[PDB]
Amino acid sequence: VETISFSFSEFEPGNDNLTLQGAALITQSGVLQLTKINQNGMPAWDSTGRTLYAKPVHIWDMTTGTVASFETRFSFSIEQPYTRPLPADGLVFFMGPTKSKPAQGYGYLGIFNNSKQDNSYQTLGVEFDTFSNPWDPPQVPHIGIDVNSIRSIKTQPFQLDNGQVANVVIKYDASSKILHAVLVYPSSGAIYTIAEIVDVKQVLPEWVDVGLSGATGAQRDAAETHDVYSWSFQASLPE
Amino acid sequence: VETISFSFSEFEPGNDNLTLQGAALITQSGVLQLTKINQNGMPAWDSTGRTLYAKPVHIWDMTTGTVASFETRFSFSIEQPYTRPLPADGLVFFMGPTKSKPAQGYGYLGIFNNSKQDNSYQTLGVEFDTFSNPWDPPQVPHIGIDVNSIRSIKTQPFQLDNGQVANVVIKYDASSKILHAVLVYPSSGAIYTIAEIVDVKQVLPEWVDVGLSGATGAQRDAAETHDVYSWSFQASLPE
Ligand SMILES: *[C@@H]1O[C@H](CO)[C@@H](O[C@@H]2O[C@H](CO)[C@@H](O[C@@H]3O[C@H](CO[C@H]4O[C@H](CO)[C@@H](O)[C@H](O)[C@@H]4O)[C@@H](O)[C@H](O[C@H]4O[C@H](CO)[C@@H](O)[C@H](O)[C@@H]4O)[C@@H]3O[C@@H]3OC[C@@H](O)[C@H](O)[C@H]3O)[C@H](O)[C@H]2NC(C)=O)[C@H](O[C@@H]2O[C@@H](C)[C@@H](O)[C@@H](O)[C@@H]2O)[C@H]1NC(C)=O
Ligand SMILES: *[C@@H]1O[C@H](CO)[C@@H](O[C@@H]2O[C@H](CO)[C@@H](O[C@@H]3O[C@H](CO[C@H]4O[C@H](CO)[C@@H](O)[C@H](O)[C@@H]4O)[C@@H](O)[C@H](O[C@H]4O[C@H](CO)[C@@H](O)[C@H](O)[C@@H]4O)[C@@H]3O[C@@H]3OC[C@@H](O)[C@H](O)[C@H]3O)[C@H](O)[C@H]2NC(C)=O)[C@H](O[C@@H]2O[C@@H](C)[C@@H](O)[C@@H](O)[C@@H]2O)[C@H]1NC(C)=O
Ligand SMILES: OC[C@H]1O[C@@H](O[C@H]2[C@H](O)[C@@H](O)[C@H](O)O[C@@H]2CO)[C@H](O)[C@@H](O)[C@H]1O
Ligand SMILES: OC[C@H]1O[C@@H](O[C@H]2[C@H](O)[C@@H](O)[C@H](O)O[C@@H]2CO)[C@H](O)[C@@H](O)[C@H]1O
Ligand SMILES: [Ca+2]
Ligand SMILES: [Ca+2]
Ligand SMILES: [Mn+2]
Ligand SMILES: [Mn+2]
């Protein structure tokens, strides 16, 4: 059995186990700020940042046909300081091709280049979408399961607890092919759940990079924070 | 669309919307005690109690072949006062044939008569099992998805926060046939998730009674409390 795991109770600046891209930055206080925060302490618009674990993960094996079960947990907070314009764009946990660089920002969240469902993307993502694009349901924010497209195959709206820490648990059972995600706000006690069948062998390459990506809007002040406090991951390939 | 829903933020003694069976009782403080609590305030062993919503639920239609999606949420607390003997047996949320009466207690949790996987049971349940019977995994307590048998098709162990309130969310998406359950302990912040594919048309009758059942052990002091603080349910039959 091939197993890989990591656990960051907090982030340390200078750590070489994480690949920071775009605006991503680790503060001295141990927080991972996916998108830029100005000198005045306000979140900057037109910003995209990602963080990928420095080691590729063996998600499935073509020879044996076996696929890994995995689980990831993380805590984040989104703060929307302005009433207008509407805040944007959200953050996302994703798995895709190794050695990747940031894609389009804004509504594409740094992982897609358009709104097509293209198999060449080879990307699986669980989004926490704060802005309603034309391909999105009307309700925002919403959790979404993205399979080779920004147009989620399943969506679940949730109420944002402004500036409060949300706990996330995403689990994938290879046997049943069920990807189940949970969002909990300890502050309000709110619990949200979403699940859908996803056969990763049809989506992802055998080896993938796992990461988090965030993006702010396309116009002045259409922004919010995308701060991550901790992140752990574990995967087991029965092989 | 046939829709049914109910929400009990607390329980009122005398309410005629709930059918209490066995030891089940609603206290003046608004708590539903599934199993018996003695005069000395300790939980009694050899006790079984259930509570069923007074109206049957239309879960699926044979004619159109459509099946309902549903969601239930509830809060409970289990208190284990003794180090020995081991506490037992647990509680369970279930759906089964209408007009049913309590079955075998103990490890059968009041909903099964043996440990066979019998289609005539026509019962679907999500258990919170505190005692390890020969048909159970070694780890207790554990969440379990029961389909026509006390021998769960899927199990998820969890750590009991003695006497603390646990929040539960169980959701079923008829389209994907995914039954997903979540347990959260606000006290410790612990989150547990379990999911499995279940086609209810193969298990349940078209109309079912929904309820909660609890049971204490087969020997002196093999007991614990099974208190429920709130319970809501909603179901929608696209028809
Ligand atoms: C977070 O970042 C940490 C720092 O980068 C990670 O820890 C490093 O993990 C490396 C494993 O990839 C590990 O590398 C090995 O280092 C050996 C020498 O250092 C040890 O021994 C010294 C005395 O001999 C001692 O002074 C040190 O303090 C260490 O105890 C070295 O012998 C190994 O080389 C062998 O294996 C490689 C690979 O097959 C061969 O190339 C080599 O010929 C030899 O056979 C190995 O060296 C690394 O090899 C690859 C090369 O490119 C690297 O430059 C070279 O360093 C390294 O020791 C530790 N660093 C420390 C300070 O402990 C950490 O990884 C996790 O934790 C480690 C301990 C290990 O369990 C990993 O599997 C974990 O992933 C990162 N954490 C996470 C979650 O990613
Ligand atoms: C929790 O328990 C509550 C108390 O039992 C539930 O509320 C009851 O819900 C009953 C619906 O099943 C409802 O029954 C109807 O009562 C009508 C008369 O009472 C009303 O109007 C009076 C003045 O006319 C007024 O004084 C009262 O305060 C009420 O406002 C009556 O007209 C209805 O009869 C018609 O429909 C039935 C069914 O087709 C026919 O049989 C009948 O011929 C007529 O056409 C109906 O009466 C009930 O009919 C069935 C019979 O066996 C019953 O004995 C008879 O009562 C009842 O009024 C309320 N009670 C109160 C105090 O409001 C509650 O149900 C939920 O809430 C209600 C309001 C409704 O929305 C339900 O659909 C909900 O489920 C329970 N809550 C839950 C979550 O289960
Ligand atoms: O406002 C945030 C929102 O912007 C969308 O892009 C807009 C842009 O804001 C507007 O100034 C320009 O005229 O039209 C663009 C196209 O709609 C992004 O698409 C959306 O993701 C958010 O970033
Ligand atoms: O001890 C709680 C546990 O009892 C099991 O039943 C036992 C019983 O406790 C013991 O006194 C008797 O001799 O044998 C019984 C069969 O194992 C129940 O099966 C279990 O569910 C718990 O209730
Ligand atoms: Ca969007
Ligand atoms: Ca048991
Ligand atoms: Mn979206
Ligand atoms: Mn069990």
UniProtKB/Swiss-Prot annotation, chains A, B:
Keywords: Calcium, Glycoprotein, Lectin, Signal. The keyword Glycoprotein applies. Gene3D superfamilies: 2.60.120.200. A minor C-terminal proteolytic processing site is observed at position 268. InterPro entries: ConA-like_dom_sf, L-lectin, Lectin_LegA_CS, Lectin_legB_Mn/Ca_BS, Legume_lectin_dom, Leguminous_Lectin. One of its GO terms (molecular function) is carbohydrate binding. PANTHER family: CONCANAVALIN A-LIKE LECTIN FAMILY PROTEIN (PTHR32401), LECTIN (PTHR32401:SF45). Belongs to the leguminous lectin family. This is Lectin. It comes from Erythrina corallodendron.
